[PDB]
Amino acid sequence: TSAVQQKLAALEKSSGGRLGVALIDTADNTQVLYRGDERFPMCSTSKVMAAAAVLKQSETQKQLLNQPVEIKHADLVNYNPIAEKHVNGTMTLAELSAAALQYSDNTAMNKLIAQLGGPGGVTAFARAIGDETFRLDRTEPTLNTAIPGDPRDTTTPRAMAQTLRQLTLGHALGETQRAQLVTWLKGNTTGAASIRAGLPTSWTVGDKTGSGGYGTTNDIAVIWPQGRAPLVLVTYFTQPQQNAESRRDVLASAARIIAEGL
Ligand SMILES: O=C(Nc1cccc(-c2nn[nH]n2)c1)c1cc(C(F)(F)F)cc2[nH]cnc12
Ligand SMILES: O=C(Nc1cccc(-c2nn[nH]n2)c1)c1cc(C(F)(F)F)cc2[nH]cnc12
Numbered sequence: 054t055s056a057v058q059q060k061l062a063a064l065e066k067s068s069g070g071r072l073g074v075a076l077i078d079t080a081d082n083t084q085v086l087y088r089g090d091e092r093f094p095m096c097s098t099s100k101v102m103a104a105a106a107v108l109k110q111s112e113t114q115k116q117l118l119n120q121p122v123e124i125k126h127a128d129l130v131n132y133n134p135i136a137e138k139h140v141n142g143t144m145t146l147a148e149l150s151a152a153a154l155q156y157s158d159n160t161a162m163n164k165l166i167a168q169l170g171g172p173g174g175v176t177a178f179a180r181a182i183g184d185e186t187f188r189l190d191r192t193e194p195t196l197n198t199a200i201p202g203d204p205r206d207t208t209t210p211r212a213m214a215q216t217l218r219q220l221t222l223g224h225a226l227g228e229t230q231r232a233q234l235v236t237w238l239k240g241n242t243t244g245a246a247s248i249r250a251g252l253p254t255s256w257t258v259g260d261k262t263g264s265g266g267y268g269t270t271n272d273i274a275v276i277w278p279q280g281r282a283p284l285v286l287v288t289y290f291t292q293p294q295q296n297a298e299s300r301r302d303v304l305a306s307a308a309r310i311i312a313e314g315l
Contacts, residue, residue, distance in 0.1 A: 055085070055314075056314065057085055057311065058087060060310045061074055061087040061307060061310055064303065064306050064310065065087075068290070068300060069292065069293065070290055070291055070292040070293065070297075070300070071091075071292070072087060072088065072289070072307060073088040073091055073093050073209070073210040073288070073290070074086065074088070074089070074210055074287065074288055074289075074307055074311070075209075075214035075286070076214065076284060076285070076286050076287075076311050077214050077218050077284065077286075078282070078315070079222060079285070080281055080282035084211075084214075086210065086211060088210065089210045089211040090209050091210075092204060092207040092209055093209070093210065093269075093271070093289035093291060094198075094199035094200075094203075094206055094265055094266075094269050094271075094289075095189075095196075095206055095208055095263060095271065096199065096206075096263030096265040096269055097157050097159075097162070097197070097263035097264070098262070098263040098273045098287075098289075099175070099187075099189055099196065099206065099263070100165070100261060100263075101154070101217065101220070101234075101261045101273065102178065102187060102216070103153065103165040103166055103169065103189075104150040104153060104154050104165060104237065105178070105182075105220050105225070105226060105230075105234055106169050106174065106175055106178035107146055107165055107168055108150070108230040108233060108234060109181075109182075109226060110168070110169075111146075112226075112227045117146055118145060118147035118150070120145060120146055121144070121145055122144055122145065122164050123142075123143055124139045124140050124141070124142060124143060124144055124160070124164075125140070125141070126141070128160055128164070130159045130163065130193050130194050131194045132157070132158065133159060134152075134156050135158045135161060136149075136152065136158055136161055137160075144161070144164075146164075146165075149161040149164045150165065150237065151237055153165055154237045154238065154241065154261060155237060155240050155241050156242060156243070157261075159194055160193070162192075162193050166192055166193075172189040172190050172192065172196075173189075175189040176189050179216065182216065182219055183219065183225075184208075184215070184216045185212075186209050186212035187208040187212060187213070187216065188208070189206055190205035197263075197265030198265065198266045199266040199267045199291055200266065200267070201267065201291070210288075210289055213287045214286070214287045217285050217287070218285045220234060221234060221235050221275045221285070222285070235259055235275070238259030238261060238274075238275060239257065239259040240259075241259065241260055241262070243262045244258065244260040244262055244272065244274070246302075246305065247260065247274075247288070247301045247308075248260055248272045248276075248286055248288055248305065249274070249305075249308075250304075250308070251305035251306060251308030251309035251310075251312060252278075252308055253278070253279070253312070256276055256279055257276070257277040258274050258277075259274065260273060260275075261273055267291050267293070267294065267297055268290075268291065268292035268294065268296075268297025268298055268299060269289075269290065269291040270290045270291075270301055270304060271288065271290065272287075272288050273285075273286070273288075274286050274287075278315075286308060286311060288303075288307045288308060290307075
């Protein structure tokens with residue numbers, strides 16, 4: 054294995070859980086993979102695929118992002134920091150995308166899923182951009198149950214990193230839409246304790262966090278290191294006990310190991 058792979062395995066053993074890592078260094082297309090082909094519950098990292106799918110729709114439905122969407126009281130689920138302010142009112146699909154990505158609002162995510170026709174519409178977009186591994190099966194909040202062995206609402210680190218690269222640095226989306234997704238990720242509010250905490254502070258990071266049952270703690274990021282071509286990094290982590298507490302420090306530690314191996 055590589056030096057870095059030894060350090061990641063040791064971090065995993067110390068953590069007591071199961072760690073998945075996939076790095077793409079776009080400077081030379083090199084990769085670092087740890088459990089890169091195992092499935093992990095995506096939790097709210099799946100919000101990137103749903104927002105991107107709506108961005109793709111807006112390439113042909115040109116006013117779609119400005120369309121008002123009704124927020125009813127019955128729509129509110131378990132974490133609605135933005136949507137709860139607009140109950141008995143409306144939010145646009147742009148505003149719902151921003152709330153889902155930057156505040157991790159679960160009601161906003163459900164509106165994106167509904168716009169796409171259900172979880173299968175998010176999966177269909179993944180297939181349309183070449184991701185044969187991603188699957189979204191449930192709405193919020195149950196897509197976060199993170200039960201060991203359950204394939205629902207999972208992907209592999211390798212597949213997620215490749216897709217995040219295609220969406221943010223490649224041509225899965227049109228130019229304006231790619232830039233909008235990057236703008237949203239760079240403005241995330243929830244990420245300072247996760248991948249970002251293991252990287253030099255001079256680097257620019259856009260990321261999407263997630264967490265769920267079994268102490269599942271996740272982050273996916275696009276990274277612009279000072280003076281170098283961007284990286285894409287996926288860090289997924291899940292634990293044996295259903296009621297386990299989150300471990301964002303493990304994601305930071307994994308990111309730090311990756312950064313020191315560059
Ligand atoms: O929805 C949930 N968590 C949540 C919601 C909004 C945002 C984020 C988040 N965003 N960035 N990190 N974490 C996480 C959740 C759901 C469930 C259940 F049972 F599946 F419904 C169990 C959980 N155990 C811990 N969290 C959960
Ligand atoms: O909102 C969150 N978690 C949540 C929300 C609603 C319900 C439940 C839950 N349901 N059953 N158990 N827990 C859990 C959250 C958690 C975390 C953390 F630290 F990773 F655990 C980070 C976040 N950043 C923004 N939001 C979060």
